[PDB]
């Protein structure tokens, strides 16, 4: 667990320092030196938007790809004794490809809204641009992570389906119902991401 111990030690030190610094700012009655609005407002909406777009596409691929290896190994392994498996159980990977597609469509619809500002001083500038910027980030994040966990779910289930089908060909059809629920999880994330950016404008 050498790496996990390293990750934890950094995690704890990271937040432990934030706790000490945050409480100290309060204790020493600093003039709101830690200004969240300043952080959020100076950070260009272009950064937030493009981050969400990259996440929407990239996280969705990670999910699909995750599931791909989960069911790939199980299918290939089982097939050593049950070559019939490839006839039906490859649909799980089709399910993973569909999970990846979800993010791609959303990511493109979001990116289509990107525009220049030619803006400088945020004061009374781009009020709508900030809303749309943050929304694009959220919607991208929303769908990305939703597809990320969707792809993992359908992978795990497809593995079980292949392992079952390898032993009894009558089980595949009934089990397949679970993977459909998994796919729906990703679609729900798509619906919200669409809503979040349904009423945004640049310029």
């Amino acid at each position: 667990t050498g790496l996990e111990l390293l990750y934890l030690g950094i995690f704890v030190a990271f937040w432990a320092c934030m706790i000490v610094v945050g409480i100290c700012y309060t204790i020493f009655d600093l003039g709101f030196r830690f200004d969240v609005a300043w952080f959020l407002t100076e950070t260009s909406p272009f950064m937030w938007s493009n981050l969400g777009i990259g996440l929407a596409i990239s996280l969705s691929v990670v999910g699909a790809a995750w599931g791909i290896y989960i069911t790939g190994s199980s299918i290939i392994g089982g097939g050593v004794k049950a070559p019939r498996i490839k006839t039906k159980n490859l649909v799980s990977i089709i399910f993973c490809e569909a999970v990846a597609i979800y993010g791609i469509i959303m990511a493109i619809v979001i990116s289509n809204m990107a525009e220049p500002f030619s803006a400088t001083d945020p004061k009374a500038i781009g009020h709508r641009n900030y809303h749309a910027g943050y929304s694009m980030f959220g919607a991208g994040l929303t769908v990305g992570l939703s597809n990320l966990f969707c792809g993992v779910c359908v992978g795990i289930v497809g593995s079980g389906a292949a392992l079952a089908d390898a032993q009894n060909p009558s089980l595949f059809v009934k089990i397949l119902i679970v993977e459909i629920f998994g796919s729906a999880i990703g679609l729900f994330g798509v619906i919200v991401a669409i809503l979040q950016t349904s009423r945004v404008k640049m310029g």
Partner: peptide, 21 residues
């Protein structure tokens, strides 16, 4: 259900296929 299938994915399918026999 996460890292398991990365290396042990093949064998898990194989060994259960052997059990089927």
């Amino acid at each position: 259900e996460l890292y398991f299938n990365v290396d042990n994915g093949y064998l898990e399918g194989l060994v259960r296929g052997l059990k089927a026999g």
